[PDB]
Design a protein around this ligand. Structure first.
Ligand SMILES: CC[C@H]1OC(=O)C[C@@H](O)[C@H](C)[C@@H](O[C@@H]2O[C@H](C)[C@@H](O[C@H]3C[C@@](C)(O)[C@@H](O)[C@H](C)O3)[C@H](N(C)C)[C@H]2O)[C@@H](CC=O)C[C@@H](C)C(=O)/C=C/C(C)=C/[C@@H]1CO[C@@H]1O[C@H](C)[C@@H](O)[C@@H](OC)[C@H]1OC
Ligand SMILES: CC[C@H]1OC(=O)C[C@@H](O)[C@H](C)[C@@H](O[C@@H]2O[C@H](C)[C@@H](O[C@H]3C[C@@](C)(O)[C@@H](O)[C@H](C)O3)[C@H](N(C)C)[C@H]2O)[C@@H](CC=O)C[C@@H](C)C(=O)/C=C/C(C)=C/[C@@H]1CO[C@@H]1O[C@H](C)[C@@H](O)[C@@H](OC)[C@H]1OC
Ligand SMILES: NC(=O)c1ccc[n+]([C@@H]2O[C@H](COP(=O)([O-])OP(=O)(O)OC[C@H]3O[C@@H](n4cnc5c(N)ncnc54)[C@H](OP(=O)(O)O)[C@@H]3O)[C@@H](O)[C@H]2O)c1
Ligand SMILES: NC(=O)c1ccc[n+]([C@@H]2O[C@H](COP(=O)([O-])OP(=O)(O)OC[C@H]3O[C@@H](n4cnc5c(N)ncnc54)[C@H](OP(=O)(O)O)[C@@H]3O)[C@@H](O)[C@H]2O)c1
Ligand SMILES: NC(=O)c1ccc[n+]([C@@H]2O[C@H](COP(=O)([O-])OP(=O)(O)OC[C@H]3O[C@@H](n4cnc5c(N)ncnc54)[C@H](OP(=O)(O)O)[C@@H]3O)[C@@H](O)[C@H]2O)c1
Ligand SMILES: NC(=O)c1ccc[n+]([C@@H]2O[C@H](COP(=O)([O-])OP(=O)(O)OC[C@H]3O[C@@H](n4cnc5c(N)ncnc54)[C@H](OP(=O)(O)O)[C@@H]3O)[C@@H](O)[C@H]2O)c1
Lengths: 331, 331, 331, 330
């Protein structure tokens, strides 16, 4: 396993981050536990979850599945950098009761206690904002997080789905009073969606944040979705983001070009999408989303792949990116 | 229910704040619980109380009534933004034993623990200074509040009965050392008393405080007190501020003009006075003071009223305001 | 002559400030020079002017009259604490060209250079904002003033026609970065208009500003305006604020009672109004507005008057004040 | 003329900003001076220029044309908020000598003195970075600007072609030590190019910067370029506009735009300027008249009220992304 620092901070992480969103709605508890055992065996020490994972009436289930895994002992909790999230509504889906979503100090306080209880742990290593909340100012947010840091309930704070200028405002505000700022941004970034290149990733690099890419396969779309389009099972690529893209002729053609390119080179589409993210400047690593232990083993192989310049150039032809602003749209 | 941010902060509140001062001395425990259940039913998530409410030998009773309400369960504590106050003497009415009133770190320590015990909760969401204390410096006050913040016993700090320059000094002092300042000012503001427009509300707006208006009907004076002047009940308008106003020929003539105006437009005096405050720039909302469940329902109707330009202009004729200083008295 | 520190700073000033607004439009250049010589002979070391004084097409004339006075030599400039103002339109009366009024760094730059030229001096001792400018932020204002301080073009900065919270915001902003804040506020304050007591003077005193009362006789109204109502000459009391007040029945009765009281006590109304301001806590002194040398001589006598407690009580009853906020309108 | 505060600061500016890039290479000195007199007559008090304007061997000519304008007197300098730029190479076109371009304190020092001399003035009201310079840190940049502020050579500092996170970093750095930060961002923004909506404008709004839009007609492309395509010089015949008209999809977009405004009897240049005036946070467009009639046309656009029907139609023809992260994530 290849390791790196998470941005500027002292925390060392596997360049594969284990996502857990599938654990519950798509992968059951026993296979979820097997995937986490295999992840630990492979040297993956960095797990990403969220309070809302589990979905609908089962929001919180994923954290509970991690909690029963940790409860088995065997140094699992000691070994893992445990990340979860606050922002989402944990009540009945639909409009949230006021301050039962978003980033008020009020919702931060109740959300962290519920996550700690489901996870069966006394601390979260990386507590992440799930989304920017434009209505909560950073002196309120940093007050709430600093309460948790000094109580020992969290160690690090990260962001997810921020704009670049939110990262800068957040960390400048933290730095004025000596607080450790955001240590990582968790952003949508993959071959299909590269617009985090314009400002989010440049800002994260300037401020020394880790960058961990969520939906690195675009929801399974990049994992061989066309070749697999007729298979059964509870495949993630059969619904949601990937299925929507495959109904668009232009997006489907792109994915078809991708799968045909890789057939000519003896490469696997999911493994290449992961390996591609590992070449991007500033990217700590993809947050892999295995549905099966087999798909985790494939991810470990992806982290060992060396993409040739020829393949990288061809991928840029199919999936061009904008580069940084202002050059992306001005000069 | 209409919602808004409390000034600049991330807390979302109903634009009706439920005042509880009547609960105890005027409304009994059973009916207070009914009013609070109905407030939650109508979407009101923001309750104001004080340690002194109850009055006399029953100071603390209002908080205890809220404590018994919370103790039923039913997500009541989780759903409510709970505001209470410190400054008042909680001992025998009359001159307080030194440091058993006002805002020393000593009285803050003892008042908050006594409030938490009566409320049956481990934290207060909005802890308010009941009045400015000119003898306690802001580095002493912010030390005391920051102790409670970091212990998790409070979340936010607010002011009540401040001058505008007190708000500015408090929040500039807080900002110097990373602290969230005052998030709201609770001030006397209604059709009868508009002098908060001079400097209190302008300073609150500059510093991004919510503004929540206490005695929004001037103690019942604006709720139809002339028409109801001969009625029984233990009506708040039969005593105190309202009764005193009706003794004065000029103030009584003003209320008469008001009630006669509203008869011509088919409007209710109590609802119009609440709806008028909701139109004022910077006002988060009125802190309604229902004596009955029907009066809470009437307040909810008031929050849906749309006052016409013609009625707003007429109210300004009856109840002119000074505008901001310096223009209010100089140029 | 009685001297005092100007609030908290090391500058010592006479408790009569010589106002120059009459110099030009009401008092001609030679009599203006005689009044300034008489003021210096009496120990008055503190002169207030403004760029706009002169009025109309003659804006700047008063500063020029002071300039020709200083140009006479004889240690006049070295002896005088020279105060002038920025904010007013110096162009054609009417709507100003953008940034040719108010407190942008652009207007501050052009205004001070024009004042310095008219006054015939290389520095202004006290450069005052004529009025709050709600559209210019304090980091812009203090940048512009600090440029002038470091160049040696001004020494001290003062306010005029501020609200109390503006004083607080201004001086907290200056103190953040080691700058000397406002040293004095120049507000309307006299027997007739006491609402600076609510917040402006309390804020000034908290922050250690001098308080220099402008229009101390309410534009001549308190100088015997009723007794002299039939007189000729270009008396200031025949126009503007004083004339408007004498056409008001209640203000006229107030002034009549005042003049009758002072007839009974054998006291001069102009002198008493000045002596009254000298008793008010926090007041550095009145800015006298003599039209003649004899009126200056009269002001000097006023500074040596001791009003009996009987007269002081009678004045407070004829001319009541509001006291400080929040007590002035709440409790 | 409608006026507004420049973002959060005390400076008041007309919502039309007079751009001067045409003065010299496209509009001659006499006509440039007439456009500036007409701008002042209509109440425009805010002029944008740059040291490089004039182009090639004539870089600096535009500042000189403004300088001879000011030299005529009549309160012209006192009335105008004068904005210019530092970053561009002022030597021979091609790779610049080291530190004769970009934002080092060394190049800032030499560039401002040369602009002051050409402009014939002792101060610049708004001195703008022409482009983000990723190699110069903000404590160096603010040192250099503060030197100029304390000497009276500039009043305000603004940015141009920044990313949103650059605006935040600059102004947080400035605020740490009591300095007034950036007061304005000058970005490309018009119907054709709306990606400043992702982060640049949202960051400017949060930090209280003015937002002034350069090439508001996309270089004349939005001024009726297809109707005038065979006319006889015209900025639309070259550069950004010409390239867009060579592309089938952009040409079709502009053809749809010009058809839409034919139906409503409106002028394309005026509508494109009026459209920017409706965008939240936009101080106004930096108009680029080549002629005095084009300036009077801009003044008419500032009085125009676009109906909601037309605004909806423009938005469908010229969709924008809105803010990040929602623009690409959720
Ligand atoms: C010393 C005891 C005296 O008490 C006073 O003289 C107090 C009066 O001057 C009050 C305060 C005035 O009431 C004020 O009328 C001003 C014009 C307002 O000022 C305005 C304009 C402004 C610019 O000032 C602004 O700042 C302010 C906010 O609003 C002000 N406002 C707050 C509303 C308002 O209180 C008057 C109206 C004016 O004359 C109010 C009405 C009801 C009135 O006739 C009362 C008469 C009384 C009780 C007189 C006795 C008689 O006792 C007398 O005692 C004297 C010492 C002797 O001369 C006695 O001789 C026997 C005897 O005279 C008859
Ligand atoms: C008002 C309703 C109209 O809807 C539109 O006009 C939307 C179109 O303008 C879209 C957005 C364009 O698609 C855009 O093509 C630009 C050149 C790209 O811009 C480029 C360059 C850039 C510089 O802009 C850069 O910033 C950007 C990121 O990428 C842009 N990109 C975001 C990809 C891309 O969305 C066009 C391609 C060019 O025209 C996409 C293709 C599929 C198309 O023909 C669609 C036609 C439709 C549906 C037309 C109706 C006709 O309805 C018509 O309604 C009008 C109101 C009337 O004129 C009617 O005529 C009478 C009627 O015509 C029948
Ligand atoms: N911060 C946020 O907003 C956010 C949002 C989404 C996700 N996340 C995080 O990012 C993690 C990953 O997101 P995601 O589940 O959408 O990831 P993804 O990798 O884009 O989608 C997962 C799907 O890709 C396929 N796949 C996974 N590994 C593969 C491999 N080695 N080879 C071929 N196909 C493979 C599987 O598709 P099939 O099931 O069709 O076989 C799998 O179900 C989540 O667990 C969560 O922790 C964060
Ligand atoms: N910070 C402070 O110093 C301070 C001071 C006072 C109050 N407060 C807070 O502000 C809250 C409200 O104060 P308040 O009780 O004096 O409010 P208020 O609304 O001015 O007076 C309450 C009275 O108004 C009448 N009323 C209430 N709702 C009505 C409606 N919808 N229609 C017609 N009449 C209506 C009732 O009068 P009748 O009983 O005659 O029917 C009621 O007893 C208090 O509960 C407390 O939370 C704070
Ligand atoms: N910062 C501001 O906004 C502002 C506004 C106004 C003034 N000021 C400053 O404050 C200064 C004073 O203002 P002001 O001229 O309006 O003062 P004022 O004393 O209220 O009015 C002056 C008039 O009072 C009469 N008077 C003056 N001294 C007298 C005395 N000893 N005995 C009897 N009557 C006397 C004269 O009236 P008659 O002519 O009728 O005899 C004189 O013209 C100005 O010179 C200016 O420096 C500042
Ligand atoms: N910060 C930067 O990087 C940057 C870059 C470029 C420009 N700028 C600034 O932005 C200003 C404007 O840029 P620009 O010249 O490219 O603006 P523009 O409006 O996009 O293009 C100017 C052209 O549009 C046409 N036009 C102008 N006004 C018109 C009207 N009222 N009706 C119809 N057509 C009209 C004319 O084209 P025809 O000649 O074909 O008639 C004119 O030459 C410049 O002067 C400069 O100050 C800044």
């Amino acid at each position: 396993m290849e390791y790196t620092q998470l941005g500027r901070i002292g925390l060392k992480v596997s360049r594969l981050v284990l996502g857990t969103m599938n654990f519950g709605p798509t992968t059951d508890e026993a296979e979820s536990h097997a995937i986490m055992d295999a992840a630990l065996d492979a040297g993956i020490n960095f797990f990403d979850t969220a309070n809302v994972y589990g979905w609908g009436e089962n929001k919180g289930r994923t954290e509970e599945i991690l909690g029963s895994w940790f409860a088995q002992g065997g140094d699992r909790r000691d070994k893992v950098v445990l990340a979860t999230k606050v922002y989402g509504n944990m009540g009945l889906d639909g409009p949230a009761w006021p301050n039962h979503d978003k980033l008020s100090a009020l919702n931060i306080r109740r959300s962290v206690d519920a996550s700690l209880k489901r996870l069966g742990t006394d601390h979260i290593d990386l507590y992440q904002f799930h989304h920017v909340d434009r209505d909560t100012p950073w002196d309120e947010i940093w007050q709430a997080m600093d309460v948790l840091v000094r109580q020992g309930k969290i160690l690090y704070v990260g962001s997810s789905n921020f704009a670049g200028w939110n990262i800068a405002q957040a960390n400048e505000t933290a730095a004025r009073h000596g607080r450790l700022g955001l240590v990582s941004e968790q952003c949508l970034y993959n071959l299909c969606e590269r617009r985090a290149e314009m400002e989010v990733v440049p800002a994260a690099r300037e401020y020394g944040l880790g960058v961990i890419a969520w939906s690195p396969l675009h929801g399974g779309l990049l994992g061989g979705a066309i070749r697999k389009e007729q298979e059964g099972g509870n495949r993630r690529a059969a619904s949601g983001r990937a299925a929507d893209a495959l109904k668009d002729p232009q997006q489907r053609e792109q994915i078809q070009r991708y799968e045909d390119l890789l057939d000519k080179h003896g490469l696997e589409p999911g493994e290449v999408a992961l390996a591609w993210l590992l070449t991007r400047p500033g990217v700590t690593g993809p947050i892999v989303g295995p549905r099966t232990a087999d798909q985790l083993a494939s991810a470990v192989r992806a982290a060992e792949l060396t993409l040739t310049d020829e393949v990288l150039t061809a991928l840029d032809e199919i999936f061009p990116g904008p580069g940084p602003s202002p050059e992306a749209f001005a000069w």
